[PDB]
């Protein structure tokens with residue numbers, strides 16, 4: 001009986017948008033929603049996908065969320081709210097949940113997901129400077145929304161959070177900071193659930209269990225165990241893929257890329273662009 | 287006539303070729319790069335990627351390419367606005383192999399080519415790679431039948447890749463006449479648009495595009511040889527045999543294979 | 551697959 | 558890294 005070895009494998013109905021710029025903690029929230037809706041801990045990615053639609057995925061097959069749902073329908077997107085596809089849901093939209101996150105952390109998260117290691121000085125510097133230059137990820141023609149459909153960060157934020165009585169006349173809108181969720185997951189997630197109004201009293205015990213089911217640790221297990229995908233273990237080098245569930249850090253310094261990059265970032269933060277305005281508004285500007 | 291003209295087909299059925307001929311005809315200019323083709327007709331799936339969509343109330347003839355089955359929800363938006371469906375069909379043997387080549391799978395990589403053929407056969411198409419395509423029979427059926435239902439205001443024409451290959455001028459003339467792109471159709475210009483779009487011109491278009499990055503058709507060459515009824519025997523007789531079995535039943539696959547002269 | 555341990 | 562195990 002020796003231990004410590006490793007195994008040898010060799011409106012009540014209507015659309016609820018879960019909208020966010022890439023890397024703002026959208027999947028975590030959807031995981032908590034799935035856990036909460038089903039009262040079961042999600043085990044693989046498909047358990048998460050089973051309880052909320054992804055617009056861009058659906059579009060890939062010519063599919064669309066129902067334009068007249070007879071139930072609450074959760075739909076994720078990173079697309080700007082003013083893309084023509086979203087205009088089909090002007091009236092059918094009942095809730096907008098918009099998740100925002102520190103652009104520093106979105107930048108670094110996106111970088112990892114682009115398979116750029118902080119060891120690759122040239123590629124990581126290039127990536128970070130493009131992000132700053134473009135006020136976000138809408139330069140990446142290969143990323144979500146083809147870049148253009150995503151917009152820069154301020155463009156995305158503005159589209160989802162402003163003039164909501166115009167775009168979605170029948171919807172309530174709630175903006176939630178990733179950082180606030182990290183701070184007090186149970187309190188903030190219960191606010192999300194109450195806001196989405198999926199029906200009936202929010203049981204704080206159900207909320208607590210849903211949060212417990214969706215911690216970084218549980219979601220790391222989910223990633224390894226999956227099953228589906230976030231978008232055949234140990235093939236060769238080329239089979240490696242960036243870790244989807246990372247550390248979920250806050251206000252990361254860009255200094256490790258070079259103090260000049262950090263300085264460029266600060267220049268951006270304290271300028272007069274929409275980027276700086278939103279960073280200030282959401283407490284990301286210091 | 288205002289309204290959408292769909293250029294619909296299962297993948298690898300000669301869609302880009304027809305679009306090239308259309309661009310040459312509409313502009314009266316031989317396409318030199320991919321962008322000259324893409325300038326003249328929209329691609330549904332490319333647009334959706336941006337959350338964009340063809341106009342639901344078009345005030346002019348609008349050409350749109352898609353590989354999706356006609357019955358997916360997105361196509362449902364265009365029930366009224368659809369004026370013409372041009373559907374291109376091609377021998378599935380050749381779609382299979384063209385698709386296999388474009389997936390950068392070598393004919394002598396026994397395991398990957400075999401696996402690819404098996405999946406094509408098991409799934410009766412390429413709808414596993416996505417479900418929006420459907421199987422070949424599902425796609426063919428969706429576009430060519432019950433069109434009075436899906437697109438109540440549209441006429442439908444189906445053309446075989448192989449017939450286009452056999453007599454480009456006669457066949458493209460029929461396409462242009464059908465699509466109703468305004469004014470009588472001058473045979474000289476059908477001839478000129480066909481000449482601008484031969485395999486040779488398109489290989490040149492491919493090269494030229496590559497030296498300018500003047501677009502992309504979606505590294506495997508997009509413009510190949512356009513072979514017909516290729517044997518799958520090289521993949522193995524069990525696989526050729528499995529394929530033939532598809533042709534010899536009374537399934538939808540067999541029905542359309544027979545119908546379009548692909549059943550041997 | 552998906553293992554693992556630690557025995 | 559990015560691939561799992563264990564072998």
Ligand SMILES: [Cl-]
Pocket residue numbers: 006007008
């Ligand atoms: Cl073992």
